[PDB]
Design a protein around this ligand. Structure first.
Ligand SMILES: [Mg+2]
Ligand SMILES: [Mg+2]
Lengths: 104, 189, 68, 55, 145, 57, 143, 75, 144, 57
RNA sequence: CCGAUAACGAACGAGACUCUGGCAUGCUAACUAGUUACGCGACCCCCGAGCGGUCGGCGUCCCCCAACUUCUUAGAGGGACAAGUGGCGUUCAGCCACCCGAGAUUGAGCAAUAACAGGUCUGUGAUGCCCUUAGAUGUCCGGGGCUGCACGCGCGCUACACUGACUGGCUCAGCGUGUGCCUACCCUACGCCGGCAGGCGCGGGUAACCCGUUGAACCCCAUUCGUGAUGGGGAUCGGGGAUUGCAAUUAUUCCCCAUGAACGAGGAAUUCCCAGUAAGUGCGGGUCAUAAGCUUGCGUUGAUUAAGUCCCUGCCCUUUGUACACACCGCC
């Protein structure tokens, strides 16, 4: 065996993130695994407001850099063993994966 | 019928001049339970007319820094004051308000850029919409100034300001500045 | 005020109206679906500005000889 | 001097404890998110790091 | 009952070496004594078990002398040690509380104590400048011009 | 500097591009600094599309 | 016609229970009640002599609404505004020994007990009293 | 117009004036009686609720800031 | 006699303050946050919350039981959220369970008195810019 | 766990590594026609691609 | 942009673009989000209600042991275009009002040719030239200084009070952060001690999992005060106690008890501003071992006036005059 895996994907761009979510859950349907839906966690936005000038002379202009971090949770819960059935990651650069057992 | 503040039916009040009949909002369409509505009254020109005048006085009564957002306090002062003028005159408080508004709005003024003798140069009669706006502001300033450093509270000082304005005794600050503006306009004809 | 159509929206409408006169009507919603398959418009906000002008020109071409 | 006083004075905290990872300067440090990067160097490497100007 | 003024009403009392207005509240009249604040006044009357809602002038004379001796003797009437002024005296270490011109000459005594040893605080008190280390670039100019 | 910039600009246009711009700034000729700019083809400067339509070095 | 404390006026309820605790002299009251300030950010001691019965009445009303609140959560509930003199105003929590002792006395009155996790909640007897006082204050308000 | 020096406590010459002519006009509030009888105003709030207990004066508003009273109905 | 599954959940929002009204077929009972409608903090503004029941009568609320929850916003924005939520829940209740002839004759009264009871106010806030202390106010400038 | 670092600081450090590597490849391979760097990172191991015009040097 | 048109074909900028806000009871989902339904509790009822009411009390991903996505989250999509009507307009470009509509002008980012002897060599292993280089202008260490005060100016905070202050109760937010390569320095629930600042042990959280339903402030509801430099104001100053650091004196910060100074709405002038705006009001981040009167963002309450003009200060286009071209701060 009985297995249950929590899979999380954390990236920066929605373009590759929706692609890696779609095809990973698409292979599971061909493998007849029971899959929980994509849990779109709230976005972590890293905001930094730094003065544009490197000297300190001017009209007090600031620069606002925003970094977007998006996380999805996908549960692969088949009644039988799961690990040997899915040993392929098929990932692309820009998205970070993490495999978690049900105990962890 | 709408029972503003729970009482004071608005179907008996009336405006005694047609120039302000269509710009005061005491009518049944603009008869409201409470003078508190965020109806976006500054989105476009000629939209403060349909705003209820009881709400308009509440808006103008918060000024002088310490009171710029507090509307719950302003509504409760208006609630106290309208009950007070009802206790002191025996008629509808709204009828007192309409009498005060008409009798406070100056009907003429003066404004130029060229050489001016005393204040301004040329006399110009005012609009009905400016009549109401100047009336409410003059009443609010009269109440505030009288109540600034005396033991009488805002509800009482606002009460005697509108009561003296409804009758007319040259004691209301609104009618006092009204007569001053009319005299200056007459000189600047 | 501030609703004048630029060269891109106007010229695209003039190109596609007279080439696809048979496929166009006077409805904003109908014409905006026509422009999708006959014109690769990268932005939705561009295509419904174009189609709104497409109906406007169609209302004139139904009466008189437009320059198109 | 010798080994006992060349670096004896404590620098476990404060501005003098922290220097920039690029320009080695002790001013304008952006320590947020563990950047430890210069105020101006951050503007230089923002695009390559992943921070972008959205608004 | 909001009755008329008592016959034995002192419009201005005289406690220690200062007068206190009887036309105000009792807890806000004894604040006029040097050394007594609003917090000190509002706990000594609690420990004297006197009515707060009555004004200062209608206090009976035996109550008044009772309040004086309670405030003059704080250490023996359950007043906390963290409530005094001259806690841990520089002279003798005892925890006292002074409420008269003796406060003024204790301030003078501490002043000449700082001046005699001529500490940094003592010297700046001699010159009339600040002592708590604040800036003198722009402020404090009212007393100079 | 004038000849080298022409060779680089022609090399970029020959390899296939919509446009190219090169700016050389510094102490050219005399003591006082100058900035010589050489632009050809199409070159936008504003908005979002500049992020993925030009390469800047 | 069952009556809940959630169905009455909270200001009238907190006053009614305060007098209830005043008349039943089982509340453990410390020796510095007349001296200390209820909050670090409050300049003066409260006017009412029975302010401890006021705090106990208030916190018993809050424990009915939600539990698990310790000293830190309670002092935030009673927090307010600190003027700081010339500095701009800030938010400062109230006294900790005040909130701790008020809850401590409630174990003696057998109406608040601790949880398996942190914080404390009401006993079934306390839930009985907190709604019984609600019933009498609802009938008094009605008639 | 320099200082009010109002009456913190009553005297006989003003207490009777409170008892006979104050509950006779339409609008009685602690501010109005304080300025009319030159009493303080804290004494005004206390005395008004004393007349409330005597029942010869009717309360209407009862607010922390604006508490309003009135004379009894005649007729 | 005991017909279940007659429930409509309709929410109304105003200035970041969200309130969801759970309407059900039951006796006359109006409660928000588990408290009665009259037992609410802004007693000065209670007439605003009593406006929806005043404009339509208690007969329309007789077979209606509403339980409202508020999970964000401010004091009066809570009021403006709830008063829109109750009316929107009522008209949706009449829209799905009875004929919309009754829905029209209850909707036209609310829309003519205050359209905020049916359409939420779209304005929320604005962002402070780095030229001043506020969204539009700029810092005091000096020349000498 | 506490051994692992938070995602907020992890993605920042990833940008730190990419910028540091890009600068180093620029300085070391300046005359070599270095163009850019791409990182293909997996938990088992990472891989670095040096986009360059003249690979024989 | 339409139209004329010695021009035609173009290019950049503007627009378009990206992000953000507002409607989607439409779709995908959610035990790190909840809502209904059901079953246990716990209490108030009991005259009896009984599907009565309430609970952030517990359960139904403690996988066969509920459903659902409205509320919450975030992706895919729609939706708004001068689209419809009337008037105006060369009836073209477009303009005005209105119905229906969530919205008929949401705010920002980016932002052209050319230029300034504008600012930065004190951001850099960016750097030319000059200077110093061992009694160093390198570097380290100790102390002081950058704080210093007859005075002037600038940005702000606090107030001058009763639309208030004090005391008690009530009762609602959203950004965002939180344990570290070097690098030592985290965010803190709960229990106990103390009056407070604080201390001691259990823990949790590398985080929609814990802090945290961020029980914020303002405001609201009651008390006292009562037109006085008063219970407004807390400046200056004494004594005492803790925390951070190796070091607190020139007081780091915080607490308590003491004093209660000017200040009664401020001349000439002058700043900013049009709708969720000003203003009131607090909360995060940056700085930080210690810390905000600074700044950067967030949230609550929420208006008055105006939908115009070139009068003042300026800007753009055309014509015009010029003895100006370092360009009227010119020339003479
Ligand atoms: Mg006093
Ligand atoms: Mg643009």
């Amino acid at each position: 065996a009985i297995h249950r895996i929590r899979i999380t994907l954390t990236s920066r761009n929605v373009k590759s993130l929706e692609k890696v979510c779609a095809d990973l859950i698409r292979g599971a349907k061909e493998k007849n695994l029971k899959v929980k839906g994509p849990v779109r966690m709230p976005t972590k936005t890293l905001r930094i407001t730094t003065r544009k000038t490197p000297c300190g002379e001017g009209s007090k202009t600031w620069d606002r850099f925003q970094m977007r971090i998006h996380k999805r949770l996908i549960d692969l819960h088949s009644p039988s063993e799961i690990v040997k059935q899915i040993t392929s990651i098929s990932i692309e650069p820009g998205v970070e994966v993490e495999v978690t057992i049900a105990d962890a | 019928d709408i029972k503003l503040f729970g009482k004071w039916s608005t179907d008996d009040v009336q405006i005694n001049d047609i120039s302000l009949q269509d710009y005061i909002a005491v009518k049944e369409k603009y008869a409201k339970y409470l003078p508190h509505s965020a109806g976006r009254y500054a989105a476009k020109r000629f939209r403060k007319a349909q705003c209820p005048i009881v709400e308009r006085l509440t808006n103008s009564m918060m000024m002088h820094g310490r009171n710029n957002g507090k509307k719950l306090m302003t509504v409760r002062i208006v609630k106290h004051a309208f009950e007070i003028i009802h206790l002191l005159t025996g008629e509808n408080p709204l009828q007192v308000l309409v009498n005060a508004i008409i009798n406070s709005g100056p009907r003429e003024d003066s404004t130029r850029i060229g050489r001016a003798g005393t204040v301004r140069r040329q006399a110009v009669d005012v609009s009905p919409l400016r009549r109401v706006n100047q009336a409410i502001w003059l009443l609010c300033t009269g109440a505030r100034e009288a109540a600034f450093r005396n033991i009488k509270t805002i509800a009482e000082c606002l009460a005697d300001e509108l009561i003296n304005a409804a009758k007319g005794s040259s004691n209301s600050y609104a009618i006092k500045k009204k007569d001053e503006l009319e005299r200056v306009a007459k000189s600047n004809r | 005020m501030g609703r004048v159509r630029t060269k891109t929206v106007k010229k695209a409408a003039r190109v596609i109206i007279e080439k696809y006169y048979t496929r166009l009507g006077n409805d904003f919603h109908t014409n905006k679906r026509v422009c999708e398959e006959i014109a690769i418009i990268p932005s939705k906000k561009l295509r419904n500005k174009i189609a709104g002008y497409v109906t406007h020109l169609m209302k004139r071409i139904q009466r008189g000889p437009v320059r198109g | 001097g010798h080994q006992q006083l060349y670096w004896s004075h404590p620098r476990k905290f404060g501005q003098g404890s922290r220097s920039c990872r690029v320009c080695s300067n002790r001013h304008g440090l952006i320590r947020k998110y563990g950047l430890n990067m210069c105020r101006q160097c951050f503007r230089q490497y923002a695009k390559d790091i992943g921070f972008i100007k959205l608004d | 009952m909001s009755l008329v003024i008592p016959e034995k009403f002192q419009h201005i009392l005289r406690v220690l070496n200062t007068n206190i207005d009887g036309r105000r509240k009792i807890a806000f009249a004894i604040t006029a004594i040097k050394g007594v604040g609003r917090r000190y006044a509002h706990v000594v009357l609690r420990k004297a078990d006197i009515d707060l809602t009555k004004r200062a002038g209608e206090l009976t004379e035996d109550e008044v002398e009772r309040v004086i001796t309670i405030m003059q003797n704080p250490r023996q009437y359950k007043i906390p040690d963290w409530f005094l002024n001259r806690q841990k005296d520089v002279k003798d270490g005892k925890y006292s509380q002074v409420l008269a011109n003796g406060l003024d000459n204790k301030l003078r005594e501490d002043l000449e104590r700082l001046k005699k040893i001529r500490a940094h605080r003592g010297l700046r008190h001699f010159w009339g400048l600040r002592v708590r280390g604040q800036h003198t670039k722009t402020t404090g100019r009212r007393g100079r011009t | 500097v004038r000849r080298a910039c022409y060779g680089v600009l022609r090399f970029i246009m020959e390899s296939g591009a919509k446009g190219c711009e090169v700016v050389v700034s510094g102490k050219l000729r005399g003591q006082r600094a100058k900035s010589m700019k050489f632009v050809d083809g199409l070159m936008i400067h504003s908005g979002d599309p500049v992020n993925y339509y030009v390469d800047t070095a | 016609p069952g009556v809940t404390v959630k169905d009455v006026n909270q200001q009238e309820f907190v006053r009614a229970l305060a007098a209830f605790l005043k008349k039943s002299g089982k509340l453990k009251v410390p020796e510095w009640v007349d001296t200390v300030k209820l909050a670090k950010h409050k300049e003066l001691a409260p006017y009412d002599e029975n302010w401890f019965y006021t705090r106990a009445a208030s916190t018993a009303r809050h424990l009915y609404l939600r539990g698990g609140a310790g000293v830190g959560s309670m002092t935030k509930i009673y927090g307010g505004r600190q003027r700081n003199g010339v500095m701009p105003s800030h938010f400062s929590r109230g006294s900790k020994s005040v909130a701790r002792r008020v809850l401590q006395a409630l174990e003696g009155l057998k109406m608040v007990e601790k949880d398996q996790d942190g914080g404390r909640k009401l006993t079934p007897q306390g839930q009985r009293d907190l709604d019984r006082i609600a019933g009498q204050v609802a009938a008094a308000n009605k008639k | 117009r320099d200082k009010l020096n109002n009456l913190v406590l009553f005297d006989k010459a003003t207490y009777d004036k409170l008892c006979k002519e104050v509950p006779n006009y339409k609008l009685i509030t602690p501010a109005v009686v304080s300025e009319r009888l030159k009493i303080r105003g804290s004494l005004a709030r206390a005395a008004l609720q004393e007349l409330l207990s005597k029942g010869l004066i009717k309360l209407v508003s009862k607010h922390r800031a604006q508490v309003i009273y009135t004379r009894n109905t005649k007729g | 006699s005991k017909g279940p599954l007659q429930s409509v959940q309709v929410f109304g929002r105003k200035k970041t303050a969200t309130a969801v009204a759970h309407c059900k077929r039951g006796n006359g009972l109006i409660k928000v946050n588990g408290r009665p409608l009259e037992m609410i903090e802004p007693r000065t503004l209670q007439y605003k919350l009593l406006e929806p029941v005043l404009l339509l009568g208690k007969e329309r609320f007789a077979g209606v039981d509403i339980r409202v929850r508020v999970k964000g916003g401010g004091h009066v924005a809570q009021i403006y959220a709830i008063r829109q939520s109750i009316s929107k829940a009522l008209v949706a209740y009449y829209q799905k369970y009875v004929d919309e002839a009754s829905k029209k004759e209850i909707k036209d009264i609310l829309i003519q008195y205050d359209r905020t009871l049916l359409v939420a106010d779209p304005r929320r806030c604005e962002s402070k810019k780095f030229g001043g202390p506020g969204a539009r106010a700029r810092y005091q400038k000096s020349y000498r | 766990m506490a051994v692992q670092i938070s995602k907020k600081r992890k993605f920042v450090a990833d940008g730190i590594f990419k910028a540091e590597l890009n600068e180093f490849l620029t300085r070391e391979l300046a005359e070599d026609g270095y163009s850019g760097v791409e990182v293909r990172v997996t938990p088992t191991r990472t891989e670095i691609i040096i986009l360059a015009t003249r690979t024989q040097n």
